[PDB]
Ligand binder design. Sequence first.
Ligand SMILES: [Ca+2]
Ligand SMILES: [Ca+2]
Ligand SMILES: [Ca+2]
Ligand SMILES: [Ca+2]
Ligand SMILES: [Ca+2]
Ligand SMILES: [Ca+2]
Ligand SMILES: [Ca+2]
Ligand SMILES: [Ca+2]
Ligand SMILES: [Ca+2]
Ligand SMILES: [Ca+2]
Ligand SMILES: [Ca+2]
Ligand SMILES: [Ca+2]
Ligand SMILES: [Ca+2]
Ligand SMILES: [Ca+2]
Ligand SMILES: [Ca+2]
Ligand SMILES: [Ca+2]
Ligand SMILES: [Ca+2]
Ligand SMILES: [Ca+2]
Ligand SMILES: [Ca+2]
Ligand SMILES: [Ca+2]
Ligand SMILES: [Ca+2]
Ligand SMILES: [Ca+2]
Ligand SMILES: [Ca+2]
Ligand SMILES: [Ca+2]
Lengths: 222, 222, 222, 222, 222, 222, 222, 222
Amino acid sequence: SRHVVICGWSESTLECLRELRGSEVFVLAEDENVRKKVLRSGANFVHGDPTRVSDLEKANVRGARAVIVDLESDSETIHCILGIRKIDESVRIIAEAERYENIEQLRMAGADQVISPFVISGRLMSRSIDDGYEAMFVQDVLAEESTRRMVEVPIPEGSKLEGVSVLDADIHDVTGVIIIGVGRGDELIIDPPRDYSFRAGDIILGIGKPEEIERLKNYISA
Amino acid sequence: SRHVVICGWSESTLECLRELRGSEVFVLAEDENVRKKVLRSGANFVHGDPTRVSDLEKANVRGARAVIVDLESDSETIHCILGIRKIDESVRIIAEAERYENIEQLRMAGADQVISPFVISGRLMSRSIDDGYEAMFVQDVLAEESTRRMVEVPIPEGSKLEGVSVLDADIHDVTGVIIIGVGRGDELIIDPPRDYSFRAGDIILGIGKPEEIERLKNYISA
Amino acid sequence: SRHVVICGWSESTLECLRELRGSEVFVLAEDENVRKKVLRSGANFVHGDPTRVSDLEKANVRGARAVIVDLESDSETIHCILGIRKIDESVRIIAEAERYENIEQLRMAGADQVISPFVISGRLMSRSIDDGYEAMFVQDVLAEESTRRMVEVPIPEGSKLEGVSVLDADIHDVTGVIIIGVGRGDELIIDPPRDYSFRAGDIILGIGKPEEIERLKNYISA
Amino acid sequence: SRHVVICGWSESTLECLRELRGSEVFVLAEDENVRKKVLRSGANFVHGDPTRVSDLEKANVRGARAVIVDLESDSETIHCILGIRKIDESVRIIAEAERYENIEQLRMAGADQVISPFVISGRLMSRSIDDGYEAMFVQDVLAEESTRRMVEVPIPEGSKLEGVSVLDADIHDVTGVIIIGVGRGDELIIDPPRDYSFRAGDIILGIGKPEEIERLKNYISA
Amino acid sequence: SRHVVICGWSESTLECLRELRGSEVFVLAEDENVRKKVLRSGANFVHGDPTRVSDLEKANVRGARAVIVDLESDSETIHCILGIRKIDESVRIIAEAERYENIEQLRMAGADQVISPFVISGRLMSRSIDDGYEAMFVQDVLAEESTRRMVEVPIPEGSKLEGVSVLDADIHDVTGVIIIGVGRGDELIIDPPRDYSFRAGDIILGIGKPEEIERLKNYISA
Amino acid sequence: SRHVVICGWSESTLECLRELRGSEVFVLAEDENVRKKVLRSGANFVHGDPTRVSDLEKANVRGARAVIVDLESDSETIHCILGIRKIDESVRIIAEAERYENIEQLRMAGADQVISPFVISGRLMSRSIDDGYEAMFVQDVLAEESTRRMVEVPIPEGSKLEGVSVLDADIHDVTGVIIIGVGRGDELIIDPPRDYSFRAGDIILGIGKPEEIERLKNYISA
Amino acid sequence: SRHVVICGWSESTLECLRELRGSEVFVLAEDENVRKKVLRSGANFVHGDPTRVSDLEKANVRGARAVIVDLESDSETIHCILGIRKIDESVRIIAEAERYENIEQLRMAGADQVISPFVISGRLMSRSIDDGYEAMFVQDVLAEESTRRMVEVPIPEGSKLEGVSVLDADIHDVTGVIIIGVGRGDELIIDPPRDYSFRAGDIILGIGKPEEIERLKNYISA
Amino acid sequence: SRHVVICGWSESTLECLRELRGSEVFVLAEDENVRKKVLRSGANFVHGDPTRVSDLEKANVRGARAVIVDLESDSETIHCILGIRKIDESVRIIAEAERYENIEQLRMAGADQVISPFVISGRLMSRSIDDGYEAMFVQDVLAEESTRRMVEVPIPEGSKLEGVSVLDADIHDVTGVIIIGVGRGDELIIDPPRDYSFRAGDIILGIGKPEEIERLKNYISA
Ligand SMILES: [Ca+2]
Ligand SMILES: [Ca+2]
Ligand SMILES: [Ca+2]
Ligand SMILES: [Ca+2]
Ligand SMILES: [Ca+2]
Ligand SMILES: [Ca+2]
Ligand SMILES: [Ca+2]
Ligand SMILES: [Ca+2]
Ligand SMILES: [Ca+2]
Ligand SMILES: [Ca+2]
Ligand SMILES: [Ca+2]
Ligand SMILES: [Ca+2]
Ligand SMILES: [Ca+2]
Ligand SMILES: [Ca+2]
Ligand SMILES: [Ca+2]
Ligand SMILES: [Ca+2]
Ligand SMILES: [Ca+2]
Ligand SMILES: [Ca+2]
Ligand SMILES: [Ca+2]
Ligand SMILES: [Ca+2]
Ligand SMILES: [Ca+2]
Ligand SMILES: [Ca+2]
Ligand SMILES: [Ca+2]
Ligand SMILES: [Ca+2]
């Protein structure tokens, strides 16, 4: 599909660029000595300031499918999000919040999704005092080297599972996948109750082996 | 129980300290102008350099139950981990990796758990271009204010579940929690296959409402 | 009257503090080194971060009548205005833009008045190549030491000039105050044409001697 | 006429260059990595230090019609002004004062007009507490985007206004421009009193529509 | 007589302070960690910034008889000189030039004497390649511990020498001093030719033993 | 004749390099960005550290007729003088002392002549309080633009002036030059008494017009 | 045999290279402007950071026979040691401790020998207060310039000394070398007592003339 | 006994201060920040410049028995030694060289012992490629914790071994102390040949157990 713009260069954007091999990535960063490390990683570099609307227009924010924003501080992130929203009002913005109090301002400033790494890291370090399985789970289902994968499966138009409850479904027994949550629109219901009924076009979040994902996609086919 | 010693001060340790109200926390940091925000957060401050062994022993590393190491770089994190392993060989160390490739260095140095925030953040960025339910799941099951809580329930000795396989157990149909992982020792097996057999002392990693957690704890009793 | 909050300390906020002798001023800046010069200037210093919503609540932004924002860059200025609107949505915010591009972004973020000094100075330089009377007008009518003063005189409800046009009124002939503009709400009509009619509740932006202003105030009375 | 030399590159001299499109301008700056921004604005770059008299004469200060000085500090602005006054004692120098107390020293150094933005911006931020009509008047009549423009007209020799007082002339009543000041040489009388007689050579500073300005040039002709 | 004010502290003003024991010296410098060595040297310290006109008046510039200006750079030396000329127009200023080409800027700014150490020492080096008697002459007649002393003797009114030419005077044969220069006003004429005629008020610059100086003043008395 | 080495680059050596035009000069300095300003001034640049005995050997200290030493601090100057004296024990060393106490150590370390600018400039500023003719005399006879020059004339073998006293000589009357001092070997006698007798091979230090020096050299010829 | 990798460039590793002329050595250093000094010493330069495991394997650490680590701090030395222990767990690592308390942490990180110069130099400066014979012994037997050299000899299989005690052997009485220590594997017995029996494989550490060393190799032969 | 002066503070002078517990030590360094760590280490701090002859006289260099010089570079070390020899020409100076070239320059400047750590460490690294028993000898015999100690035992006048050779004496057989060197004045004879004869007043540089040294001391008595 279309290209992806990454505003700023840090460690989070480096791992995002490592997992975005194959698609087209434009990196818009300020320093000129990052050109070798961006161009080595398989993405074109655009020298400029990410808060200026002209340099955002240079790096082709308009036709992109999502713009990933991570600058050095949090105020520059809010500035770049406002600049992107003056350019385009439909492009997807993914931001990085450095402090916990700024997530509401980063959502009201226009970002579609705010990822706070330090709050995740703090809660994982607070939860690894007694026994450390939560951090192992979160760091293994997001790694593209394990046997289990956390994927989204979509409900097609006119599937076999339209309107039937999840207690009458038993997706885990016949497909072998773990259903951790269902998604409709911009809301997510983790561990749905027995009375939840599926709709057409839903997004089901599941963890399972790849052949179990194939049995799931063959199970909810039309 | 005993106390928790935090070496180094960053936003990760701040968000860890917000979740650790109710225990006794000794914070050890090189800067003295962070003393007011540590003492405001219900934690004790110890001035010193965490890389040095004497300034570590100022902050009671021996009688601690877990030490949380997040310093300014990765070299200081490795040096502080080795300084702690010089003091007590068996204390639990939870590190934090600033880059990706130093996770193996931090596990060779002596840390029992390496939590890399930037890798989780980058993979949650790259898995949120199309649809971002995964970021919502990861950031919502950790916060201890929502309706669903991910906990660890151990299998006690003399249970009704020892030797019984997971497909014979049917814990999701009875208790209401979702068995997303079984851990025994330091190994975590996500999505256990149906031929897996439980034992006494294994840890069940599940997500569920607190009523379902009480029902699960009443389900595995003797 | 109520107090005035000044966020950030720089050369613009210093010269505003001289013209605000007589009221109570809280100065909210990050560096401790400016505590001496503010307290000699007659304002209670509050050590805090102006971008933080907690430290803004210390400085009594809620009961204040105006908040003057001038921070070290325009990204931190936009961050501070969003923090104020998170606290109070009806307070008056006077900002300062550093570059020309950010004036539209600063007003959509919530500022009622954007006073950009580098646009005023950059256009007074290029209009002073030939002969400098534009800069001699602006820099003399604002200082409270010249013979003339540019003041704002309101029209009370029930005035003698309610509904009469500006040609039949003849303000400069009967009083001597030069009428350079009339304002209604958030609009200013520079050099109003002779078909414009007055209304009760209007403001008169005029230049004149103080005795001429006293001749204007009793003239527009009921 | 001749060219215009700009000593130093800052945000004030950047927006002096937008109003100086069409003329020939040399920018004398120390930093080498501003060379792209000067050339994109339509101005030649001369690399050198503006305080050195050799590097001034590289940028052709002898034949210029005005030199615009805005350096990083008030010390280097005064040092650069005396470097120009060693070259040519007849050229016109426009300088920018950072602080208020260095205005009178920049005039003794030889500058013909000192434009201090932080005293203008500081006085506009204090007059915009109650109602922001002063800052709207300044930032509109200088911008060449709105209708009314503040222009200067001279009185030529043998004019119809030569020897006439301002109460008999009634310039606003016939032409339609607002005469806010009339200046002889290097003085300016804002709101001229009724006993002021016009003389040949005085500069009338007026505000009006461009149709009203052309009527003023025909009203004062020979 | 009156006091001497020294602005700025360097190695030049330290050796000036050793030769000025017996008068009252007010040292004005920006650093406070030089307070011990000034008060040890028999001089009073005033903390402040010498470039500011208010912090000059702490150090009593008006009633002084000479101000000695040696700051950290050459731009600071000019901006301090112009502050003194704003305070008192007729006080004597002895500057010090760090470079060669800024000697003319310091005389335009208002200094009555520019003493460049790096030009004197830079010309004493290249004149000491072959034989260094010229470096020995300059450094020994200034030191007030040797046997020969270079002094200035003024010609009083009503002398026996007024109108008498130098070749008729024969001062070297009678007094023993060497008339190496005659100064009247601000001009110094080194090696006066034989047709030169003295006047009352002229200054005789001569070198001689302390016995020969007392004979010279008795030679030119009434 | 042979070449001259200048160890170090500062303001003193630049004024030494302006008067060494025509002769061969090697400059040995540490920074690589001074290569433009030395090669523009007419001398070859040798990149290296002046304290290393190898880098002194690169700049050809051995065959030079004098080596001029001026480094950044006084401690490096004693190091560079000791480094030269291990190489050659007959080459002429001219140093620059930054402080007054270091002059005695710089002579015992091996420099033939120590030039202290801050003691010269210190004693000129203390002597320019009353009247400034001492500083005007030193800065004109060392400048190669005046009418009078301070030169060194040698006594040839078998001159007319051999053995005769200076009272019987009357050099000032018949040659027109001012005799300020005589030099034999490494000693200098400023203002010799009447009983001083000339020897062959002396260096006489005199100030006079250029034709007055030619009358001097013709007078003391053989 | 194989090559030798040197991680980092300092004055210790500079003088490791003078003793390693003739072998093949790679120097891994971050700074680019040391490349000429490495190449002039007879060593290949590999540009890169020694803490990164990629930039180590560029410098061929897999096949080396020893790696010498001396980085700017003790933190980066421990981080670089664990970078080598991730590559090859069998290579020999020689490291330098800056401080004394970081010796035991460099041994836990994996270094086979920690050479701390500041503890050796600190103990020689305390033993040279009374008489400086300790510091003369160390700095002579290591230098390959004097006559006596401290070399190591192994005891091969089936030797004449195999099974003999040190009082019966009388090595100094027959060969002439001074046996100061004999070491088995990774231990060393300085001044071995009389009941020490030699075994096959022990390393005899002795001091003697090169004629005496060859007599020792014949005395212990098979 | 008398006191010890330590000029400059670094890691070498810290480890010397540990071995000097029991005497009085004055530490003369520039930075105020090391005042706390010296006073905890048991030495009276003196704030001063070690290169200055005035501040050396504060630290009682005259009555001292040894002055240990280790400053931040070798140029300041040579400067400080010349200052001590300007004060006292008979005091004992123990220096520290940073590079190999300066060891001859440091001893001609007046130092009695130059202990260069980077020459010792750089030659212990290259002798530890094969097997590290040289570094295990030096770093263990100097520490005052091992079983053996390298001490100096003098020969008193009138001893039993005055005039006997080293072969007829048989020191290692009758006592057990290994004789590694004998010293006379400023010379050390490592591995003395059998034709060397003893003298009264000699020093014995030996390695052995403390009971063996007590067996040596009563053996060489009169
Ligand atoms: Ca970031
Ligand atoms: Ca847990
Ligand atoms: Ca499964
Ligand atoms: Ca961190
Ligand atoms: Ca997704
Ligand atoms: Ca449930
Ligand atoms: Ca500002
Ligand atoms: Ca104009
Ligand atoms: Ca400026
Ligand atoms: Ca107002
Ligand atoms: Ca009009
Ligand atoms: Ca008027
Ligand atoms: Ca100076
Ligand atoms: Ca000469
Ligand atoms: Ca005389
Ligand atoms: Ca210098
Ligand atoms: Ca004088
Ligand atoms: Ca003459
Ligand atoms: Ca090192
Ligand atoms: Ca000793
Ligand atoms: Ca021997
Ligand atoms: Ca023994
Ligand atoms: Ca050192
Ligand atoms: Ca070896």
